[PDB]
């Protein structure tokens, strides 16, 4: 469903523990939004996959 998507980032760890977090805004139509973490607790934004 369109809306917020709170998931666990387990492939971004890149051979490390502490699985990260991600929040994806999925519109009914338009551009996706992504707020992901890093293994250093830094919050990054990806508009679509860029």
């Amino acid at each position: 469903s369109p809306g917020v998507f709170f998931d666990s980032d387990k492939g971004k760890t890149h051979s490390s523990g502490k699985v990260l977090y991600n929040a994806r805004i999925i519109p009914y139509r338009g551009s996706w939004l992504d707020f992901e973490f890093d293994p250093k607790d830094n919050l990054f934004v990806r508009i679509d996959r860029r």
């Binding site: 369109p2 009914y28 551009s31 939004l33």
Partner: protein, 99 residues
């Protein structure tokens, strides 16, 4: 913010316009237009009623519905809830839950 190399609107818009659209020497007017297109177009950026409802529930808003487009309040709320999850007191959405 320490990682963020911007502190003002025009530089951020320049960077975002360049990274959405590689090359293409940036124009602040073009960057503003692209940002408005990406998050404030009423004709090609829709959340629909279902998206708004799920969105508010994910943010656990007292609201039931609202705009079909994204707002600053929406982004700040989603960042707040993501930070809450990072703090270990939020919830992670089940990928397959039929809700």
């Amino acid at each position: 913010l320490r990682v963020d190399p911007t502190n003002d609107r025009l530089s951020a818009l320049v960077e975002i316009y360049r990274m959405m659209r590689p090359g293409e020497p940036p124009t602040r007017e073009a960057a503003e237009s692209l940002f408005e297109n990406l998050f404030f177009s009423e004709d090609r950026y829709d959340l629909s009623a279902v998206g708004r409802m799920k969105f508010n529930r994910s943010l656990l808003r007292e609201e039931i519905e609202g705009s079909g487009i994204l707002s600053k309040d929406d982004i700040i709320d989603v960042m707040k809830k993501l930070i809450d999850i990072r703090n270990g007191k939020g919830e992670v959405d089940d990928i397959d839950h039929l809700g």
